[PDB]
Design a protein around this ligand. Structure first.
Ligand SMILES: *Cc1ccc(S(=O)(=O)N2CCCN(C)CC2)cc1
Ligand SMILES: *Cc1ccc(S(=O)(=O)N2CCCN(C)CC2)cc1
Ligand SMILES: [Cl-]
Ligand SMILES: [Cl-]
Ligand SMILES: [Mg+2]
Ligand SMILES: [Mg+2]
Lengths: 227, 9, 227, 9
């Protein structure tokens, strides 16, 4: 997208969201990142929403095909599952590449750095969901390491109700439960996060209260299912 | 177990 | 898809449907058509479902962007609407090309020939929805001509409750209402189709009755909105 | 005005 203006790529990403054209949205936001400038809060959210939709569709498809393939055990189901898996891995590698070149290294504020490291944990987590080979343990550790650095910054630099801090803790708890086979760590993280947020709600405006309590409810929903 | 949906800006 | 077996392309199209991967589904069915053999009833339905999903998403996106563009009257909204429009036209041209090379000319039974001519009317209708230039009247006439030939065959060769005959009449009535600016023709076609089907229901098994009455309800739904 | 949905086999 090298010939399109940065501002035009951002505008088109917003239009693509309205049109539910998420592959386009992701391509526009990739182009915007490759302009080399840091991203504002709104622009980071556009990048994240675009790729979460793209990879979300791939993950749903991979799960359908993996289920059919497990029940089957011709080559067609495995071949097609492998095709979808390779496309998913390609998208995760693209996002991880944007974070490494060069979003994270230029992110100095806690809000941007935590945001990108949470992304890095999520996309390694999506790689781990499909991994089976010599590097599967290394993929899991890469997710853990990214989430852990994000957690360390967020506890030092953000209030316990900050929505990015809350969503990071939610996703790290899912990592523990679903990927790392650590359900007790998942439950403890979700409970401690919820309780520390509850105790900080009194400091918030009405709008911030709504933002924080929405994610707190997601923490409670997981706790209900896990306990 | 639900992660952040994260699919609407 | 020239290196993949016909049967494998069909199997993968069914898997792609289950995975909601409609672009893949359409590519697999295009490959199957290009093997050169005629399509069975089930295979024709797979081809139709794949492309209706692909073009349905494009049409929904085009409508969102066209609405934003009309309200706006920078170049970005028009540019992006034009991009989506060109992609939609490309898909319609691909389907029309498959019908012309060589599905229709080898379709000798009424069920297959009516099916493909209905498709031809639908894809010219989708072209007409976005057309604005020197050939817009010719696009509309191409849709009308395809639907009319399908109608003529269906009235001679199929009972009034045949689901393909019913769906053809439904879509031709939508053509009259939405494209040809002939609401009275649309209403008359929908009413006559519904009444002639009603009078033939007594001949059907329970399963055929369900198939026919489902489409009859779509005819009634349009009549309710149009009258 | 609705045409055949036609989106599920
Ligand atoms: C990973 C993550 C965490 C929080 C959120 S949010 O709360 O939906 N969000 C996005 C913009 C809205 N803003 C007001 C609060 C932060 C999304 C994703
Ligand atoms: C254009 C059109 C017309 C009818 C139908 S259907 O009734 O849904 N159909 C598809 C296969 C099922 N079969 C039993 C009846 C015919 C779809 C599209
Ligand atoms: Cl910086
Ligand atoms: Cl033939
Ligand atoms: Mg510039
Ligand atoms: Mg062969």
């Amino acid at each position: 997208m090298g010939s399109m203006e940065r501002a035009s790529l951002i505008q088109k990403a917003k239009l693509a969201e309205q049109a539910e054209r998420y592959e386009d949205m992701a391509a526009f936001m990739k182009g915007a990142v490759e302009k080399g400038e840091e991203l504002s809060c709104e622009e980071r959210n556009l990048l994240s929403v675009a790729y979460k939709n793209v990879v979300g569709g791939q993950r749903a498809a991979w799960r359908v095909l993996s289920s059919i393939e497990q029940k089957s055990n011709g080559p067609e189901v495995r071949e097609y599952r492998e095709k979808v898996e390779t496309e998913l891995q390609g998208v995760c590698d693209t996002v991880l590449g944007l974070l490494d070149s060069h979003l994270i290294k230029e992110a100095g504020d806690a809000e941007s750095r935590v945001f990108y490291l949470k992304m890095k944990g999520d996309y390694y987590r999506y790689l781990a969901e499909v991994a089976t080979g010599d590097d599967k343990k290394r993929i899991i550790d890469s997710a853990r390491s990214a989430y852990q650095e994000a957690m360390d910054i967020s506890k030092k630099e953000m209030p316990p109700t900050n929505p990015i801090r809350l969503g990071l803790a939610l996703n790290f708890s899912v990592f523990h439960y679903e990927i790392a086979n650590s359900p007790e760590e998942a439950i403890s993280l979700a409970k401690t996060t919820f309780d520390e947020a509850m105790a900080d709600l009194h400091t918030l405006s009405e709008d911030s209260y709504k933002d924080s309590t929405l994610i707190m409810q997601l923490l409670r929903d997981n706790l209900t299912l896990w306990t | 177990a639900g992660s952040i949906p994260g699919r609407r800006s």
